[PDB]
Amino acid sequence: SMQDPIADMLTRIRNGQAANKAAVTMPSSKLKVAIANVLKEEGFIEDFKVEGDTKPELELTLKYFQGKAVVESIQRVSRPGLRIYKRKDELPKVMAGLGIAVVSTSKGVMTDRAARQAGLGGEIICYVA
Amino acid sequence: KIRTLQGRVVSDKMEKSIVVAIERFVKHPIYGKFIKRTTKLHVHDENNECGIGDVVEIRECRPLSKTKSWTLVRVVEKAV
Amino acid sequence: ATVNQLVRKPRARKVAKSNVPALEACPQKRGVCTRVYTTTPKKPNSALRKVCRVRLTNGFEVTSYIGGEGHNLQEHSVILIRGGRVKDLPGVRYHTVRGALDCSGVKDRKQARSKYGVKRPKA
Amino acid sequence: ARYLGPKLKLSRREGTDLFLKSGVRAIDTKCKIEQAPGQHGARKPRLSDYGVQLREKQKVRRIYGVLERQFRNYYKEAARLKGNTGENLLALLEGRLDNVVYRMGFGATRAEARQLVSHKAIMVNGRVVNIASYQVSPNDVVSIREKAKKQSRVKAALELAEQREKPTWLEVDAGKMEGTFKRKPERSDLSADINEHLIVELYSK
Amino acid sequence: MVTIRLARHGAKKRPFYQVVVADSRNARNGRFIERVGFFNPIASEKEEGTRLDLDRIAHWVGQGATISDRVAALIKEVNKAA
Amino acid sequence: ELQEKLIAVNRVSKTVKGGRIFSFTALTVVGDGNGRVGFGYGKAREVPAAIQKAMEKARRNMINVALNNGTLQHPVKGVHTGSRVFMQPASEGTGIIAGGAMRAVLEVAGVHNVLAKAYGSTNPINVVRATIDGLENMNSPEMVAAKRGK
RNA sequence: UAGCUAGUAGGUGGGGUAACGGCUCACCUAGGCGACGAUCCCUAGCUGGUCUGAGAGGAUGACCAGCCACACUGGAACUGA
RNA sequence: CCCGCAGAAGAAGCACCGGCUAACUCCGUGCCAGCAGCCGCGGUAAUACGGAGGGUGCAAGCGUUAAUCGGAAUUACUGGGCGUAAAGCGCACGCAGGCGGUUUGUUAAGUCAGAUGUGAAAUCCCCGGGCUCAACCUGGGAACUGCAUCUGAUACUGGCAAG
Secondary structure, eight states: OOSOTTHHHHHHHHHTTTTTOSEEEEEOOSHHHHHHHHHHHTTSSSEEEEEOSSSOEEEEEOOOSSSSOSOOOOEEOSBTTBOOBOOSSSOOOBGGGTBEEEEEETTEEEOHHHHHHTTOOOBEEEEEO | OOOOEEEEEOOOOSTTOEEEEEEEEEEOTTTOOEEEEEEEEEEBOTTOOOOSSOEEEEEEEEEEETTEEEEEEEEOSOOO | OOHHHHHHSOOOOOOOOOSOTTTTTOSOEEOOOOEEEOOOOOTTOOSOOOEEEEEOTTSOEEEEEOOSSSOOOOSSOOOEEOOOOOSSSTTOOEEOOSSSSSSOOOSSOOSSGGGTTOOOOOO | OOOSOOOSHHHHHHOSOOSSSOSSTTSOSSOOTTSOSSSSSSOOOOOOTTHHHHHHHHHHHHHHTOOHHHHHHHHHHHHSSSSOHHHHHHHHHHTBHHHHHHHTTOSSSHHHHHHHHHTTOEEETTEEOOOTTOBOOTTBOEEEOGGGTTSSSHHHHTTTTSSSOOOTTSEEETTTTEEEBOSOOOTTTSOOOOOHHHHHHHHOO | OEEOOEEEOSOTTSOOEEEEEEETTSOTTSOOSEEEEEEOOOOSSSSOSEEOOHHHHHHHHHTTEEOOHHHHHHHHHHHHHO | OOEEEEOOOOOOOOOOSSOOOOOBOOEEEEEOTTSEEOOEEOOBSSHHHHHHHHHHHHHHOOEEOOOSSSSOSSOOEEESSSOEEEEEEOOTTOOEEOOSHHHHHHHHHTOOSEEEEEOSOOOHHHHHHHHHHHHHTOOOHHHHTTTSOO
8 A cells, every 4th residue: 555555465355355255466575475474374364475576466365264254353553653562571462362463573573472482572563363 | 971862963053052953752652653852952062063964973061051061072974 | 533633732631610619619608698589490390499699708699499398597697508409490509508507407307307407306 | 336136037038047046946936937027028029130139248248247348348358369259258258256156166146156256255376356357267276265164155055056067167176165267168168058249249330 | 977776667556666777867757778677666576576687787887877876775686686 | 941031121102193002122131051142122012922022032043152161262342233342251250240231141141250341322222232243253262273273 | 822032042251159050240153942832821839659440541749758949028148067 | 455343234326218229108298398319209199298107228327518530432542433413624735744665785763672770768469477356567579560771683663875
């Protein structure tokens, strides 16, 4: 999007899933791909692949275990306009741990299970659930 | 050498003195938005040797005049 | 609503008028009870009620209802205004205490006897 | 403090036998259990979702003779502890000396225990205690001082106890007439029909 | 005039004293510098009546601090005991 | 063996030409101690029949709940026609800290230890539904783990 | 309350205080402050804390303690660490 | 504080009872006297006023008034809205401001981690201890969610440079 290229991808993921699409496409980033790894390895989505040189477009292959989607509700938290940063202990829990958060830690982007084990807080990218 | 508050000189007209404007984030205590709060502060420059708009490195000294308690150690940018 | 908009002017407080202006945090007030009214209520009610202008100490003149089982005041007896609006008169919002200052209690009154200035028939 | 109490129109309202009176009183024998607490007879009680926790809160208060100030203090210091708030209430009500002197088998009702306690009779850990609220810590050894060992009551009221059940969290050596509150009472052995999760909602408004 | 006087803090009829290091000019229940031990005048082996932290008292005394009247006895009643 | 609890009742009216006919509503909630709810709402002309009809429509719409061990898996939030509802699992022993229309639905589903709140209009007819929305949108750790790698 | 400010902002020198400093004097420079709210008006002692609240917050600042300010109203200074 | 002597000997009120809310019957009154926090009562029974009996609640107290927060998500940061319920300037342009695609390098200001000082004592909480219990006093801890300095990281945000 013109001012939030990451809430834009999240909106892609949970618009193209109300419509029940198999796969969605968007112009990729480095942070977009860094997220996509954390999504696709916590099983929130099948697998992705980025492709393109002048216009490297990210395409996620959405997942769903029934008519229901596996991704219930992703929430963009650290909006440009209100940047949200947390410490290693005040890291949010999503659905009391059932769902995943995505934070930008000094050692990269990861979940909060792993960034709470790693003892290193971050920048709350989005709640994944 | 205490923290050598980097700043950008606003007005080098006044004799042997300048006005350095420090800029700072601070998270807004009640709303949470990182706001930009400037810290304008008079600096004694001994030779009028810095022109408007160059980042300098200033230090705390004893008061040197009414409302002038900072002198700079060294300049790290040219005005233009 | 935008957090930037709240920054540029704070989310303001909601001001609220006190209900009993002539008391100003004084739980009671003395007065002069300068003369007595018997004005009738609104349409839904009847049974004209006993109210009296009072010159309170702090200069405010107000009307105060003299509720009870019967009436005993006069036109210059000093009375103790209380608060606690009455619901019928168009603004009798002070409710004189019974049996504290020079206003006597009520006659032959056995129940809720504390809310009136009568005290323990031998029983 | 104790207020001389509602007598058996107390227990008649709650229905169950709230022990102000103990003897052959379990069967009616001039008690008239739930004929009428007064003006109207067996009027159907349409208690609201509120009335049915006031009923149980004042079943509990009026078993032991606690009051609203002491019962709310017990509530708060049961709700600042760790664990099941209701079982904490019943625990710190069961450890009360007025209670324990009864559960010991001494006396015949907790009014008699509250009077024996208040009259220096029960003496715990070797030093006389005449506060009825004295929370008996575990491993204490309650007793009866020499002056009141054979006074008039505990010789017979104790014989009014063996037919009664033996509370299993404290042991009673009645032959020597000194007891030992051995450990902390639990909910299971405190075999009462009291639903804690009505009281706790009553106070947690 | 740094002093090692005592401040009275317990309830009525039952005083409890902190052995405080404070200068003279402050009211005994005003400001102070350091709180090195306490004194509970009640007796009959309820508990330790005194804990006193002798190393900071020795430091302050060697630094120019006037060890006061009652606390002077408090010192050696510890040393005489132990 | 199902528990059953009424919620409310109404003096709903109607203007016919001659008169003004009245009715009675009796929304009801039903379950057992295992997470089942056929919350019920049944009209009639006089309350015993409305109550019976609401018991009946109730015992039916058993839309299954996912009780954890007497409480919620996670802090559900519900909404239905202008009645927001927040629920959150609570500690053992802590009772049903819940309002009016939610007390009954929470209790009959089998829950014992939760703390709740309602925020829109507190009309029972919709609180009972927003609550049950939320409680169908539960996610047990076993079935979130089912729909991806555990 | 949208402009305020001439010892007013700075610099030379004297002079002044335990001490730096327009702290004061002569002189020169013509600045300084202000939308990130100056100046003006109204109210107010400030804090640890208190109450309330799930909490964020709100409201307060009697008691106890730290700092401040005053001592019939208004000037001044002496004596002295 | 302990011990002796008496005798139940000296020690119970207050509000409330129509719904909200635990707790109703009888009589007098007859839109009158009156009540009332709200809904609302009183014009021929009125469980709503006044009295009695009875019950409920609290108890050396118990009621009323005043004041604060709550409930009030009713100033909504957590946590609201703006078609018709209050609410999109009549419309543009635009300085300041606020936000900013993408890759690499750099910095390390925001951020994060760790560390060091400091955050008075008492308050608050925790495990205790002493007052026959409790209020109360008290030891030790925790806590004081802050500030400043230092050392690391460098994902994200900012700077600078190259695209």
